[PDB]
Amino acid sequence: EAPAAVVTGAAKRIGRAIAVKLHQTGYRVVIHYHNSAEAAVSLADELNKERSNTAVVCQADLTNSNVLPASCEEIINSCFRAFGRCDVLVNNASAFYPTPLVQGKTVETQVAELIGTNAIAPFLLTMSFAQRQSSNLSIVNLCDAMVDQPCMAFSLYNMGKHALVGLTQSAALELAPYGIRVNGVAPGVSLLPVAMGEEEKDKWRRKVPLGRREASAEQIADAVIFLVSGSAQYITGSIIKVDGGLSLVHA
Amino acid sequence: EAPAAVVTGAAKRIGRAIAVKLHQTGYRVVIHYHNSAEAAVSLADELNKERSNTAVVCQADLTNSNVLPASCEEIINSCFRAFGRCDVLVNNASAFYPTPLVQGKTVETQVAELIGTNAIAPFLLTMSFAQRQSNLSIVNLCDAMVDQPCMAFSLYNMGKHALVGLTQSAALELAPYGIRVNGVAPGVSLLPVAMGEEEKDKWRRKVPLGRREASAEQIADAVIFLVSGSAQYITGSIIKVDGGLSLVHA
Amino acid sequence: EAPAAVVTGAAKRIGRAIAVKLHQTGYRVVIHYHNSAEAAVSLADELNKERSNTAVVCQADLTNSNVLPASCEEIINSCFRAFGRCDVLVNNASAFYPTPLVQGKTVETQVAELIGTNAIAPFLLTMSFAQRQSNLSIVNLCDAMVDQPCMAFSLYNMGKHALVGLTQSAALELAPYGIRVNGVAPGVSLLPVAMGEEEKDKWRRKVPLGRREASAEQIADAVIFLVSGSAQYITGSIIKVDGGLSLVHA
Amino acid sequence: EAPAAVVTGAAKRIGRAIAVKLHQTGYRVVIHYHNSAEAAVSLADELNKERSNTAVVCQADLTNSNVLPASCEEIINSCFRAFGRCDVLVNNASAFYPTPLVQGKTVETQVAELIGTNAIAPFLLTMSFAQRQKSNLSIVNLCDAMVDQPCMAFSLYNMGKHALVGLTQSAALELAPYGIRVNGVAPGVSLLPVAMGEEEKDKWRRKVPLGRREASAEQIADAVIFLVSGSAQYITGSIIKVDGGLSLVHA
Numbered sequence A: 001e002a003p004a005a006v007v008t009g010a011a012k013r014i015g016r017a018i019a020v021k022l023h024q025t026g027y028r029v030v031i032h033y034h035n036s037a038e039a040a041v042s043l044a045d046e047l048n049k050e051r052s053n054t055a056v057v058c059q060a061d062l063t064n065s066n067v068l069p070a071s072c073e074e075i076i077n078s079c080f081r082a083f084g085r086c087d088v089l090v091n092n093a094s095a096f097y098p099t100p101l102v103q104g105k106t107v108e109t110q111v112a113e114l115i116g117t118n119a120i121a122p123f124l125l126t127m128s129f130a131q132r133q134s135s136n137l138s139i140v141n142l143c144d145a146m147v148d149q150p151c152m153a154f155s156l157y158n159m160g161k162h163a164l165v166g167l168t169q170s171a172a173l174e175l176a177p178y179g180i181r182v183n184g185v186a187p188g189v190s191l192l193p194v195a196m197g198e199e200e201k202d203k204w205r206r207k208v209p210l211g212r213r214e215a216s217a218e219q220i221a222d223a224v225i226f227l228v229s230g231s232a233q234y235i236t237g238s239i240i241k242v243d244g245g246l247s248l249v250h251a
Numbered sequence B, C: 001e002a003p004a005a006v007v008t009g010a011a012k013r014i015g016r017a018i019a020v021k022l023h024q025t026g027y028r029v030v031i032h033y034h035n036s037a038e039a040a041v042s043l044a045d046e047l048n049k050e051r052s053n054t055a056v057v058c059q060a061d062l063t064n065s066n067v068l069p070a071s072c073e074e075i076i077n078s079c080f081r082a083f084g085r086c087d088v089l090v091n092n093a094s095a096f097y098p099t100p101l102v103q104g105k106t107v108e109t110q111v112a113e114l115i116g117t118n119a120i121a122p123f124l125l126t127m128s129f130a131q132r133q134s135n136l137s138i139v140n141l142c143d144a145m146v147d148q149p150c151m152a153f154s155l156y157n158m159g160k161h162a163l164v165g166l167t168q169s170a171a172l173e174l175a176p177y178g179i180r181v182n183g184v185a186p187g188v189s190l191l192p193v194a195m196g197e198e199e200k201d202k203w204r205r206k207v208p209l210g211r212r213e214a215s216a217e218q219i220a221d222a223v224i225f226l227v228s229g230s231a232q233y234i235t236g237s238i239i240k241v242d243g244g245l246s247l248v249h250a
Numbered sequence D: 001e002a003p004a005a006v007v008t009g010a011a012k013r014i015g016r017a018i019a020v021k022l023h024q025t026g027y028r029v030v031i032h033y034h035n036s037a038e039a040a041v042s043l044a045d046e047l048n049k050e051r052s053n054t055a056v057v058c059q060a061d062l063t064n065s066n067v068l069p070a071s072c073e074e075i076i077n078s079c080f081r082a083f084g085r086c087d088v089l090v091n092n093a094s095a096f097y098p099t100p101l102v103q104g105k106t107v108e109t110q111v112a113e114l115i116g117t118n119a120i121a122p123f124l125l126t127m128s129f130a131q132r133q134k135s136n137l138s139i140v141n142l143c144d145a146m147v148d149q150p151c152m153a154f155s156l157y158n159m160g161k162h163a164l165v166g167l168t169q170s171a172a173l174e175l176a177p178y179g180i181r182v183n184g185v186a187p188g189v190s191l192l193p194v195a196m197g198e199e200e201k202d203k204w205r206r207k208v209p210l211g212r213r214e215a216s217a218e219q220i221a222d223a224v225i226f227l228v229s230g231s232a233q234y235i236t237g238s239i240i241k242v243d244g245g246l247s248l249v250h251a
């Protein structure tokens, strides 16, 4: 039988490209989404046209709350339900906006979204994934290459990403005896936010030493595919920058 | 007029040592505490016997909740109420216990406490400190072993990682205000009251420099360095006080 | 036409596995070696029996000296002489042995060998490589345990640390020329011939993932990924291949 | 009676400021120097005017060669000849200039100067220091906050400073049983070349979060003083950035 993978925030952009490649590689996928129902479904439609009954969707808010644990257990159950197994978890879903330290959402809501999506939900999905277990089990967390050169006023986001590094390493250590590997892919700039101004996107583009451009989503997905593959079987607790050298560049 | 410091979890152990040392250097101090009220007031008494009207206590749960932001603001407000200023904030309070990934409290509670004390409360207290504004600085009690995590401590460890993020993020954003943010990262220091001597000795034996844990004073010494005029250009630095522990391989 | 790679210290162990895999992937290979002459020609025989005119050997001492820059230029010149091009450089050769800080090679020789092989030759090889210039990249064999040094291996460790800086500096400088520079950082892979069986086991039992060292093939897999088209945006990255070993506190 | 320190490259700029403050703290000093005899001597004169017979000067090229280990043994020995003891070693001397990868010093000379001064001499000085011990003994190495965001075309310099981090950690571990601590100070930008145009100096100053300026040599010296003091007695293997947050600033 073919392995199955969960990819969070998989309706669009990097998470979409990750789902697609895992699928092209032979996985069945659970495409998780929060708000993008329509996009999640048309992706599943497209993958199930290629290969019948190989893609399902799964809706969940990953904001931290009293139900998040249940929600995350249900994401992992959906995969077990659809496909009878869960081999791979990609923690890609992420909320992202500025939370300036010095003066909309209340601060406690910002904590819940930024820390819940970037770190608490990953921890709870990891728990549920491991609890439910020639197989090749792994987890890939979508990290941040620039996490030690944080953006101005993005302190909660940055806290969540740093937490996610902690989880990556802690979970690699603790789940090694189960044969579950835990790694990370850390983009620098890849697809820039649809919202982001065009001059603002070019500013970032021009700082990238390898080609003065952003990574494609597919280039990010390549690292993921490597990490879940049989050729990464001794690798756990490793976070691979896919940043074109951006992190190396001084102010 | 004397500067003022807030030290969280200051009723005993390392936080008491940081407040004692801050007091000896001439700070007025707020001794924040959660459950250890007797130890808190007993300390504020010793300190006020030494110079009167220079220590107050302040009780607060720093578990994450929707009122944690108010609570952290009230902590900063307590320092201005007592002393008319707030120059230093030391984030020392921390919950710690195992949270195994494969299986007491609910997990929602473990999240709230481990992440809230180690990370969210430090962020809120930082916002509050900065919003209320010399030599202004913040010092976070980090973990020298943060990149070699203890088995089954993932939520604690996530919290100490996030506290690194904050140290770095806040140092960048608060620089324009002349507010420095740095950290102090013990290895093993005072071991927990729960721990038996045999398990303490197991950790002691791992330390290259002397095969013993840091004294609480030794941690406080580095905090005192970082708040001083001698570290005026230092911000975003996290100083290990670990006697070489983090350098030792498995 | 087929791309070509130079692999240093490729006659045995990890470097051999890398040469083999690069060769299986479609590459022509320069097999560099120092002393291991028989195993080197033996490997090119195998390779060339599989695909004629796709491997050549190239002998060089990579100890630091005033002629190293010439020896390194010759290694790259040899790749061009044999194959008309040089797409990939792998810096794998390395000397390793204790150099205690406190009391039959002289210390000037220990410096030249350990820093030579592990750092200066890589630098010189990278200069010569870039000077002669498609998916062009370089891979350095680094050490996952580098921030957790082995006792009395300061010179070796210094070499590996330097190789980190080289990886990163060269990534930065060569990016405009389309040349990527990355690392693979084993923990414990095939353990030395001369290592006792008790001390091998001792390292094996430390590894979380599977309680065993990596196979050379496992290391090579990560090299293969980094030179491949699935890594076209990766530069300046160092990928640990250590089964979690570096995550384990003392 | 009074403890003794060796400071390499102590005739000007940072090393001088370090030697002055150690002296002000009550150390006797060996002022090592390469070409700057006149500043070295003039400092030793200023210092011996404060306290008779508490400063000596000691010339040596710290370029890697066959003689470098003797020279480094000689620098240590001279502190013992002058003061009867050697309590503190500061590795401050450093060559610094571009060594581009692609196109009158030859490259073997560049290697010898940049690697010798920034790494190899520090190592040899450490072993001579330790050999002679076998009281608060420690070693402070002058590192670089920016070592992971290197300046373009300084690979040999950068490689030396990276090697110097490894030595700081390696020596800390190996010499801990002798009660010798080994730590670093890692400036970001400090005293800038007086020759450099102010306009160019300002581009660097403007990047520094804290104060938009470079560190004084005295500010670097303060961290060195902390690290050799009785208030750092459990500290070893640590590298204190003194950088005004410069290393936290993305491109």
Ligand SMILES: NC(=O)c1ccc[n+]([C@@H]2O[C@H](COP(=O)([O-])OP(=O)(O)OC[C@H]3O[C@@H](n4cnc5c(N)ncnc54)[C@H](OP(=O)(O)O)[C@@H]3O)[C@@H](O)[C@H]2O)c1
Pocket: A008, A009, A010, A011, A012, A013, A014, A015, A032, A033, A034, A035, A036, A037, A060, A061, A062, A063, A091, A092, A093, A094, A095, A096, A113, A117, A142, A143, A144, A145, A186, A187, A188, A189, A190, A191, A192, A193
């Ligand atoms: N783009 C980059 O340059 C970049 C750089 C560094 C790191 N990364 C990391 O790489 C990953 C992918 O980046 P990206 O730009 O593709 O992500 P993105 O478009 O910002 O977000 C991806 C998905 O996250 C989901 N999400 C947001 N809040 C959520 C919530 N509360 N609950 C559940 N899902 C939620 C959204 O799903 P719905 O649309 O279904 O609501 C969204 O489509 C992220 O983890 C990001 O931090 C990206």
Ligand SMILES: NC(=O)c1ccc[n+]([C@@H]2O[C@H](COP(=O)([O-])OP(=O)(O)OC[C@H]3O[C@@H](n4cnc5c(N)ncnc54)[C@H](OP(=O)(O)O)[C@@H]3O)[C@@H](O)[C@H]2O)c1
Pocket: B008, B009, B010, B011, B012, B013, B014, B015, B032, B033, B034, B035, B036, B037, B060, B061, B062, B063, B091, B092, B093, B094, B095, B096, B113, B117, B141, B142, B143, B144, B185, B186, B187, B188, B189, B190, B191
């Ligand atoms: N000790 C070590 O070896 C070690 C090692 C690495 C890092 N560190 C760090 O150094 C710092 C000091 O360590 P320590 O051993 O002195 O700490 P500790 O004794 O475990 O805790 C310090 C205080 O934190 C407070 N705290 C706990 N839960 C709280 C909550 N929900 N709300 C508010 N406050 C709460 C407690 O207050 P009450 O007593 O008033 O209830 C406690 O006295 C910590 O941040 C620690 O993580 C210590």
Ligand SMILES: NC(=O)c1ccc[n+]([C@@H]2O[C@H](COP(=O)([O-])OP(=O)(O)OC[C@H]3O[C@@H](n4cnc5c(N)ncnc54)[C@H](OP(=O)(O)O)[C@@H]3O)[C@@H](O)[C@H]2O)c1
Pocket: C008, C009, C010, C011, C012, C013, C014, C015, C032, C033, C034, C035, C036, C037, C060, C061, C062, C063, C091, C092, C093, C094, C095, C096, C113, C117, C141, C142, C143, C144, C185, C186, C187, C188, C189, C190, C191, C192
């Ligand atoms: N094995 C591990 O557990 C491990 C762990 C961490 C990092 N690594 C790194 O992985 C790489 C490969 O490791 P390995 O165990 O396969 O290496 P190894 O067998 O110890 O050394 C590889 C080759 O380097 C060459 N070499 C040694 N001194 C030389 C000199 N002066 N000039 C030129 N070549 C010289 C030798 O060539 P001849 O036989 O031709 O003389 C040797 O065969 C090395 O960079 C190593 O540092 C290995």
Ligand SMILES: NC(=O)c1ccc[n+]([C@@H]2O[C@H](COP(=O)([O-])OP(=O)(O)OC[C@H]3O[C@@H](n4cnc5c(N)ncnc54)[C@H](OP(=O)(O)O)[C@@H]3O)[C@@H](O)[C@H]2O)c1
Pocket: D008, D009, D010, D011, D012, D013, D014, D015, D032, D033, D034, D035, D036, D037, D060, D061, D062, D063, D091, D092, D093, D094, D095, D096, D113, D117, D142, D143, D144, D145, D186, D187, D188, D189, D190, D191, D192
């Ligand atoms: N300045 C900064 O912004 C900065 C930034 C990062 C790190 N650092 C580090 O901080 C330390 C002090 O910096 P600095 O700017 O004060 O250094 P500097 O002025 O560039 O150099 C200090 C001294 O090093 C000595 N030196 C150079 N080559 C030598 C050789 N071959 N043999 C023996 N001695 C030699 C020189 O002695 P003579 O004058 O006697 O010839 C020179 O005065 C250095 O280690 C540096 O890398 C500085």
Ligand SMILES: Nc1nc2[nH]c(-c3ccccc3)c(CCc3ccccc3)c2c(=O)[nH]1
Pocket: A093, A094, A095, A096, A144, A146, A151, A154, A188, A189, A190, A191, A192, A193
């Ligand atoms: N979920 C999510 N996470 C993101 N992280 C980043 C990022 C973070 C730090 C530096 C650069 C890019 C980005 C790219 C956009 C960006 C650009 C500049 C600063 C912060 C973020 C991103 C995103 O679009 N979605």
Ligand SMILES: Nc1nc2[nH]c(-c3ccccc3)c(CCc3ccccc3)c2c(=O)[nH]1
Pocket: B093, B094, B095, B096, B143, B145, B150, B153, B187, B188, B189, B190, B191, B192
């Ligand atoms: N709030 C608080 N935090 C602590 N962190 C540590 C610690 C953590 C990781 C490695 C070494 C010591 C300690 C020392 C005890 C300890 C040891 C191992 C895991 C968790 C805690 C500690 C503590 O007593 N209180």
Ligand SMILES: Nc1nc2[nH]c(-c3ccccc3)c(CCc3ccccc3)c2c(=O)[nH]1
Pocket: C093, C094, C095, C096, C097, C143, C145, C150, C153, C187, C188, C189, C190, C191, C192
């Ligand atoms: N050229 C080369 N480099 C090596 N590095 C290591 C290594 C280094 C640090 C920790 C563990 C293994 C090893 C594994 C054997 C070893 C173990 C401990 C110290 C130095 C070497 C190794 C090797 O066999 N050849």
Ligand SMILES: Nc1nc2[nH]c(-c3ccccc3)c(CCc3ccccc3)c2c(=O)[nH]1
Pocket: D093, D094, D095, D096, D144, D146, D151, D188, D189, D190, D192, D193, D196, D201, D204
């Ligand atoms: N021996 C020695 N080592 C040095 N390292 C640095 C440095 C290196 C990397 C980033 C910033 C400054 C410097 C200062 C280099 C510099 C000079 C002018 C503007 C910005 C940086 C330095 C030096 O002057 N002497």
